[PDB]
Amino acid sequence: APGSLSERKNVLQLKLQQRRTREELVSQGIMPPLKSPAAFHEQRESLERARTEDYLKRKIRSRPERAELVRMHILEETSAEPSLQAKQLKLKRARLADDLNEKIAQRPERMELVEKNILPV
């Protein structure tokens, strides 16, 4: 109860094996990274922040227009709404393959063409 020198020793030995590795703890954002400087985690942070802020503030001005992505086939063209898209596109491909099916199915024989004044004997 008092924290007798011997009992004080057992809780410790039992809690010092209950312990994760600090590697694991910066791994979880409790620890700052081993290897950086102990004083100056603050400034270090500030600085990496800046670095990022600069990148964002630039990459932002250059930001393309949706349209330009569509030009490139990044975003599907063009309506309707984000959620429907996924499906809508599957509907598109499906309906097209179908509309192609009969189209090729009912494909004239060569002589149809030849007599139709297209292509030689």
């Binding site: 039992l14 209950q18 694991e24 910066v26 791994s27 979880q28 954002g29 942070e45 922040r49 670095r51 990022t52 802020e53 990148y55 964002l56 503030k57 990459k59 932002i60 001005r61 930001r63 393309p64 949706r66 992505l69 490139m72 086939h73 990044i74 975003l75 599907e76 709404e81 984000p82 959620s83 898209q85 996924a86 596109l89």
Partner: protein, 335 residues
Amino acid sequence: TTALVCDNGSGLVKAGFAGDDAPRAVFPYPIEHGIITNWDDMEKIWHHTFYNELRVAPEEHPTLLTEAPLNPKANREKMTQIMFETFNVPAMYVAIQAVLSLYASGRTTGIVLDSGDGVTHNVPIYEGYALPHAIMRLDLAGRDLTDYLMKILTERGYSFVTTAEREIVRDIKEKLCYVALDFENEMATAASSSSLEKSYELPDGQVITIGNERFRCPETLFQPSFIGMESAGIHETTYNSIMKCDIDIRKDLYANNVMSGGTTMYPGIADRMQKEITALAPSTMKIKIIAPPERKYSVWIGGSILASLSTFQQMWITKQEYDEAGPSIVHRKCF
């Protein structure tokens, strides 16, 4: 006179101020699965955030809100409506969580894995643009994991079912669980020796002991079947998501796989995801998995960062703009 960042999570609001490198307030369902379903409830949540957590004049600060991938236009418009009419916020803006997470990573192109409390998405994003047709949802999230850990601590004899007991098990999850590199092998080794089991002291002093459960719970993320789902594992879903993107930016994506959200904190989830994604992808593919230590709050941080840019000042939605164009304005301004 600065900006507020509010990430409305399935399980946890993260609110704070533009600039700071972490949310000041984080507190605990009208947004299960990531989409705002109950607007009265939600309105009360926002009130509590504005007045009780951040203790601020909602009319005095611009507000950046987060929304889930594939939030319906109607939804965003509603958020906007409420911010402007129920809070007379000077201005405001709505952002896609996954995207914010990516920005905080210091990128504009990559594929995010955002696994929070009630939902998990894969969002491929390009120069800020999330590619909807490739987005993946996966209603298996953190809660579910907590549950399954309860339901498997059962085989050990322990019986947690109280809401309070649930919370206990959650803490156990967070403290001891971990994704294994090779699951079958990790099971083999599980039996082989001890050194794997750990000890956990309940609130009431009683010490329980946990074994392979540690790595089986999170394994659910890779095998949804473990909790009865025909869905594919997060890694598979990632792969599929990538592949649904234009063939040219594929490379950029395999090379820029950023993880966010609480549920991605499990030790080893990175190396594992690497293993799997690597195995599914073309043998000559650069594959990189980014797992920022700060990712339990990726989103919110990104939010902050963004709301802080001098550039970004030009793109807020002013109260005036809203008056002149109504909620619809959102669709033109935030994207």
